[PDB]
UniProtKB/Swiss-Prot annotation, chain B:
Annotated AB hydrolase-1 domain residues: 48-332
Record SUPFAM superfamilies: alpha/beta-Hydrolases
GO MF term (any one): deacetylcephalosporin-C acetyltransferase activity
Name of the gene: CEFG
PANTHER family cross-referenced by the UniProt entry: HOMOSERINE O-ACETYLTRANSFERASE
GO biological process: antibiotic biosynthetic process; homoserine metabolic process; methionine biosynthetic process
Subunit structure of this chain's protein: Heterodimer of chain I and chain II.
Identification of the protein by name: Acetyl-CoA--deacetylcephalosporin C acetyltransferase
Role noted for this protein: Catalyzes the conversion of deacetylcephalosporin C to cephalosporin C.
Metabolic or biological pathway, per its Swiss-Prot or TrEMBL entry: Antibiotic biosynthesis; cephalosporin C biosynthesis
Active site positions: S141, H328
């Protein structure tokens, strides 16, 4: 697995048998993870960070300023852990990992849900001897896991910080990610998911990423970055290669089948399914203190759906980041997110 | 054989023997397709220009049918309504699909044209038709860009304007979405650098360009109402997949790749201030006509804020915010509300 190979050092827990909620049984399942800091004697200073769609467990690489003394992820006070999701190319079981029935899983990797990841991740935490979680913190896909973690109850998960995220798959997002998968499906190199690993559907992947990358932006943000010279890169000419450069580097270092498997997780997401008759009723079952962090200008996860979260989670504070950035604000305004998270964790 | 033009109802073609693009490139023997409804009065001053959207033909009736008729906005009893096809389009005006007078269609070699070029050649046509004054120019999306450009002829020739869901200048946001769309076409191996044979189009590229465009035309609330999940313990999320494929396919079967490229590139040239003023607000202040600016809050391509700006720098302007949750394509999904707003404005003194 060349994708996992490109990462820094990380741990792998192996679960010999895991039952997916579909009822499919995975065997001898790797779960990659990365932690920083040390558990206290009480084993109750654990902080779980849930990563984004395409990242690895190495949160430091896209959230570097959230780490350190007096920062949100304070390695002096907390044991901070991030576990890689099933379906990802970066160490946990997915299309890229070995199929214990021979050859990697490839196109045949079973469907997994947010709830599957949470269950398997809590198994790993149990093995590490974590007895209580001080907080779970997660953005985008991470915020969906974060919301799901909360259901363990306040006795195991003391606080949550869902960021830029939702309670359930929406038609809007389903459409954007389905569009992205279709770019891959239509790439003749895809061969139904049977492509050889060093001959990826690279155009499909690129295109999927250009689209995704733009949905992560706001109109003001791209307007500041690219604009025309006065009446009478940064110019509009430069848009072309900006779009190409980034999507190319990503297609060179991610797997098509994992992109499909990961985005499909979004379709399973619903915090209410099997639990409550509606989303507000399910949110009301979240008893922990919650800090909901959002931006007005997020084009994927709407301000209003966060306002809804804050309104139905009984002990919740809504934190609106003062920014014009759009969905990737939690990365572009990392310092503001850090302060908000740190302040919340300090009460 | 332009099969795209062939699939249209009957329309007129004006022929301009020589036309100088603002690049300095000279087009020869230039067709300009158009369609009108109604009749000019004796004074030849009851002309309403409708500027079409990026991918439509001049046949406005086919996407705006309810705007036409007695007591409607485009009242064929009061007005001579005309829509002229843009240069670069596959539907009659000069473009990649039309014959190259040096030979064989222009194909990939059709020159860059601007919003200003369309406005110029269109006014030449109106002059031949004997139009002495325009009662109003109405246009949405790309049409709103031409609309804003028409207005600079001054209040003596262009009495009123109705720019809808549009902008004053190309933005990074829109440049990125349309460049992404073009790259889908460039990357399709059937494209052959624009040299594809006309009945072997880069259909996958085109399809994909249009799925993306179609979504940018929507809003989160609109897609959410249309597709969602069964509650806790057509319309399901399963259906999204084929909803996306279906119209994108029908479109890629009935549009030209090269025209898609040429048309979207027009957006890059758009700037009402270039050569005229130091900034967009200064250029907007040069628009003296009454203006009705129609928009939706949830337009993901042309922002509510930029329409608010228009309304603020155009001295005689009213902002009309359509009560809808639809996104950019509201002007089609809520056609009746647009009709009422337009008619109301045209009925004004
Ligand atoms: O939601 C999730 C996102 C992911 C993802 O993998 O799913 N992210 C990334 O990948 C990315 N990290 C960066 O984008 C670095 C910023 C560089 C670039 N966006 C820029 O500024 O031009 C975050 S932002 C969007
Ligand atoms: O700006 C441009 C638009 C165009 C275009 O051609 O360039 N339009 C069309 O094409 C379309 N007319 C329709 O009837 C399409 C329905 C809207 C569609 N997004 C959908 O419902 O899927 C309008 S929607 C907006």
């Amino acid at each position: 697995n060349r994708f996992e190979a490109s990462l820094d050092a990380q741990d792998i827990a192996r679960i010999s048998l895991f039952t997916l909620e579909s009822g499919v049984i995975l065997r001898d399942v790797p779960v990659a993870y990365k932690s920083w800091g040390r558990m206290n004697v009480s084993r109750d200073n654990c902080v779980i960070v849930c990563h984004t769609l395409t990242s690895s467990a190495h949160v430091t690489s896209w959230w570097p300023t959230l780490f350190g003394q007096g920062r949100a992820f304070d390695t002096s006070r907390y044991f901070i852990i991030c576990l890689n999701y099933l379906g990802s190319p970066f160490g946990s079981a997915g299309p890229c990992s070995p199929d214990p029935d021979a050859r990697p899983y490839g196109a045949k990797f079973p469907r997994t849900t947010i709830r599957d990841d949470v269950r398997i991740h809590r198994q790993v935490l149990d093995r590490l001897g974590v007895r209580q979680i001080a907080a779970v913190v997660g953005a985008s896909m991470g915020g969906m896991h974060t919301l799901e973690w909360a259901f363990f109850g306040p006795e195991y998960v003391r606080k949550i910080v869902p960021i830029a995220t939702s309670c359930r798959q929406s038609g809007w997002c389903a459409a954007w990610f389905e569009t992205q998968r279709q770019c891959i499906y239509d790439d003749p190199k895809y061969l139904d998911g049977e492509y050889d690993v060093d001959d990826q559907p690279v155009r499909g992947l690129e295109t999927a990423r250009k689209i995704a990358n733009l949905t992560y932006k706001s109109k003001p943000a791209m307007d500041e970055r690219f604009h025309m010279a006065p009446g009478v890169g940064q110019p509009i000419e430069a848009v072309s290669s900006y779009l190409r450069y980034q999507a190319q580097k990503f297609a060179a270092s991610f797997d098509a089948n994992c992109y499909i498997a990961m985005t499909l997780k979004f379709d399973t997401h619903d915090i209410s399914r099997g639990r409550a008759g509606s989303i507000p009723e399910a949110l009301a079952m979240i008893t922990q203190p919650a800090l909901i962090i959002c931006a007005r200008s997020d084009g994927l996860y709407s301000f209003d759906e966060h306002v809804e979260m804050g309104r139905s989670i009984p002990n919740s504070r809504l934190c609106v980041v003062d920014t014009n950035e759009g969905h990737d604000f939690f990365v572009m305004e990392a310092d503001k997110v850090n302060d908000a998270v740190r302040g919340f964790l300090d009460q």
